[PDB]
Amino acid sequence: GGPSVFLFPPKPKDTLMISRTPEVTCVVVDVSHEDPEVKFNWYVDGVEVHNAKTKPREEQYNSTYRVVSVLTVLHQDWLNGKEYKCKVSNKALPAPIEKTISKAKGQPREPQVYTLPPSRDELTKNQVSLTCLVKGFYPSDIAVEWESNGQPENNYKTTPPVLDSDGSFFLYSKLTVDKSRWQQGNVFSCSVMHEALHNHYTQKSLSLSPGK
Amino acid sequence: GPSVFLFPPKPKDTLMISRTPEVTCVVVDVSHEDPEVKFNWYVDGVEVHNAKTKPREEQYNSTYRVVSVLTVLHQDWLNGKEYKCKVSNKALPAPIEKTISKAKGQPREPQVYTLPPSRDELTKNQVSLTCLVKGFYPSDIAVEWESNGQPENNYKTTPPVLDSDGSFFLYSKLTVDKSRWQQGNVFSCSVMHEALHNHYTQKSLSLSP
Ligand SMILES: *[C@@H]1O[C@H](CO)[C@@H](O[C@@H]2O[C@H](CO)[C@@H](O[C@H]3O[C@H](CO[C@H]4O[C@H](CO)[C@@H](O)[C@H](O)[C@@H]4O[C@@H]4O[C@H](CO)[C@@H](O[C@@H]5O[C@H](CO)[C@H](O)[C@H](O)[C@H]5O)[C@H](O)[C@H]4NC(C)=O)[C@@H](O)[C@H](O[C@H]4O[C@H](CO)[C@@H](O)[C@H](O)[C@@H]4O[C@@H]4O[C@H](CO)[C@@H](O)[C@H](O)[C@H]4NC(C)=O)[C@@H]3O)[C@H](O)[C@H]2NC(C)=O)[C@H](O)[C@H]1NC(C)=O
Ligand SMILES: *[C@@H]1O[C@H](CO)[C@@H](O[C@@H]2O[C@H](CO)[C@@H](O[C@H]3O[C@H](CO[C@H]4O[C@H](CO)[C@@H](O)[C@H](O)[C@@H]4O[C@@H]4O[C@H](CO)[C@@H](O[C@@H]5O[C@H](CO)[C@H](O)[C@H](O)[C@H]5O)[C@H](O)[C@H]4NC(C)=O)[C@@H](O)[C@H](O[C@H]4O[C@H](CO)[C@@H](O)[C@H](O)[C@@H]4O[C@@H]4O[C@H](CO)[C@@H](O)[C@H](O)[C@H]4NC(C)=O)[C@@H]3O)[C@H](O)[C@H]2NC(C)=O)[C@H](O)[C@H]1NC(C)=O
Numbered sequence: 562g563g564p565s566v567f568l569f570p571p572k573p574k575d576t577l578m579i580s581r582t583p584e585v586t587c588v589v590v591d592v593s594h595e596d597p598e599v600k601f602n603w604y605v606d607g608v609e610v611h612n613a614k615t616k617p618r619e620e621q622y623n624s625t626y627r628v629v630s631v632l633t634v635l636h637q638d639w640l641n642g643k644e645y646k647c648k649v650s651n652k653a654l655p656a657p658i659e660k661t662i663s664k665a666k667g668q669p670r671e672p673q674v675y676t677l678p679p680s681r682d683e684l685t686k687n688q689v690s691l692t693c694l695v696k697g698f699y700p701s702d703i704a705v706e707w708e709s710n711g712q713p714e715n716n717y718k719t720t721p722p723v724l725d726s727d728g729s730f731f732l733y734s735k736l737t738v739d740k741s742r743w744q745q746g747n748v749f750s751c752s753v754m755h756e757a758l759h760n761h762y763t764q765k766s767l768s769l770s771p772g773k
Numbered sequence: 774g775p776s777v778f779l780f781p782p783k784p785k786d787t788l789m790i791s792r793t794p795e796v797t798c799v800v801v802d803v804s805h806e807d808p809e810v811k812f813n814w815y816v817d818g819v820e821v822h823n824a825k826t827k828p829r830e831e832q833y834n835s836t837y838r839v840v841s842v843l844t845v846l847h848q849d850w851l852n853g854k855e856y857k858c859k860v861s862n863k864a865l866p867a868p869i870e871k872t873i874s875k876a877k878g879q880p881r882e883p884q885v886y887t888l889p890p891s892r893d894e895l896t897k898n899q900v901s902l903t904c905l906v907k908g909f910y911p912s913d914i915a916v917e918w919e920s921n922g923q924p925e926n927n928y929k930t931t932p933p934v935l936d937s938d939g940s941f942f943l944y945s946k947l948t949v950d951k952s953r954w955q956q957g958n959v960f961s962c963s964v965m966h967e968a969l970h971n972h973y974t975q976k977s978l979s980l981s982p
Contacts, residue, residue: 677888718934718936735942
């Protein structure tokens with residue numbers, strides 16, 4: 562029966578930018594009225610820390626309690642693969658639940674970023690597919706965005722990372738634009754940001770340039 | 774009850790008359806003290822049991838992993854029919870529920886575009902051939918690559934993503950020693966989907982000057 566705990570890593574973007582603030586979030590659900598008290602203990606690489614901001618108990622519609630705890634994580638700590646452990650106690654369980662999260666273990670590998678123009682058979686349609694291929698990155702955490710003329714193209718989709726045959730990861734992003742917008746010869750760019758990239762950021766762009 | 778799981782057939786099994794599509798009922802966390810599990814199967818309500826309840830198996834922890842399997846008609850599954858697996862275990866409360874069927878809605882036909890590696894990838898000893906498959910519904914799909922009617926092995930295919938029109942897409946990526954691409958060898962993306970004339974289309978890709 563009883564309470565369950567879930568531990569959530571930061572957003573890859575948060576991790577990779579000095580500006581942003583990465584957080585690790587430990588959430589408890591199914592906390593009865595009979596024993597509503599929950600204690601959190603946090604550990605970084607096995608050693609307790611006490612800077613974690615813990616929200617007041619929010620009652621839920623199944624009459625079950627739910628309490629969140631948020632540890633602010635130093636960027637470089639995450640990127641050096643520090644281990645974050647949430648330890649949850651409730652007088653409703655034999656032993657206090659433990660969860661541990663980190664960046665995945667391995668050597669980082671740098672993203673290769675290629676753009677692919679739409680297929681020839683695709684010109685016949687009203688909308689076109691602009692492809693962004695990102696291969697050979699590790700670990701899998703990553704963000705992918707499209708823009709044109711300094712402004713975000715918000716009509717794209719990105720697949721999850723996929724475990725390649727050589728242990729690394731690949732993925733694809735597909736921006737769909739009104740075919741006319743490609744005709745005009747616009748410039749479209751696929752911004753990618755990952756730990757193994759210089760400045761944690763690269764961008765490549767694409768357009769139609771026939772003749773040579 | 775201990776966790777119970779229903780599973781569809783694979784896209785491919787369901788798309789060729791020759792194959793044998795099966796629905797699966799994996800029952801986890803069955804314990805030594807009370808195991809003698811019943812399974813019963815119903816399609817669109819009705820009693821059937823042409824199902825073969827696989828002989829048991831244990832696992833890593835103190836737990837058994839047990840399974841049943843039922844063979845299925847290609848049309849029945851393509852026609853939406855629900856498949857339910859009631860799983861009688863008198864260790865805990867009552868019968869168990871799990872329905873599954875195919876996703877509902879007008880099957881849409883996949884568009885298939887082969888893309889070639891970018892110039893930039895050409896300064897490497899292996900290249901990437903891209904196969905875009907978009908606009909398809911439902912997401913049950915199967916993708917393969919080949920050359921000279923012999924099958925290419927070094928490719929991986931991404932899962933399908935909900936595109937913004939409620940259709941799906943995916944990409945499949947074939948990896949070849951850049952020497953082969955030079956030759957001009959033809960490479961084939963083969964997509965199998967219910968909304969396809971004959972459940973199969975194939976697009977070709979080669980070095981065009
Ligand atoms: C009573 O009512 C309440 C609520 O109404 C019920 O609570 C629910 O209980 C469920 C358990 O039965 C919970 O389980 C699922 O939860 C997670 C997914 O939770 C996230 O996503 C859902 C939407 O899908 C959201 O609703 C949640 O709020 C969670 O959202 C994320 O929250 C994070 C922190 O808030 C967000 O982080 C942000 O990002 C910032 C970046 O810096 C910053 O860090 C902050 O973190 C924050 O800003 C994050 O972005 C949110 N994401 C989204 C998309 O919104 C799900 O993972 C669980 O699945 C796991 O566990 C099951 C087992 O139960 C596994 O089968 C499953 O596959 C997976 O576990 C896998 O296996 C192992 C070990 O288990 C792991 O090591 C693997 O990694 C793991 N993953 C795999 C295999 O893929 C689970 O299904 C549900 O969250 C609860 N809801 C709420 C609101 O809390 C309660 O159950 C009810 N009880 C009853 C009896 O009725
Ligand atoms: C002791 O150790 C053992 C061994 O480790 C533990 O066993 C584990 O038991 C778990 C029960 O808790 C199992 O559940 C998890 O996994 C299922 C998915 O199952 C597949 O996934 C993994 C691969 O990652 C495999 O290990 C499994 O075996 C399953 O493999 C697929 O199953 C089929 C087998 O028949 C294959 O297809 C068949 O193939 C045939 C030919 O080969 C033929 O073609 C057939 O036609 C075809 O069917 C298929 O190919 C297999 N392989 C792959 C790679 O796919 C997962 O669904 C569970 O999570 C879901 O449900 C939980 C509820 O507990 C939710 O929390 C969670 O969110 C999640 O989704 C939600 O579930 C609800 C239902 O509750 C749905 O209605 C919702 O829609 C859904 N949400 C959303 C948003 O969609 C769960 O994660 C697990 O399989 C076992 N693990 C292992 C390693 O074996 C055991 O736990 C241990 N015991 C104890 C006490 O600790």
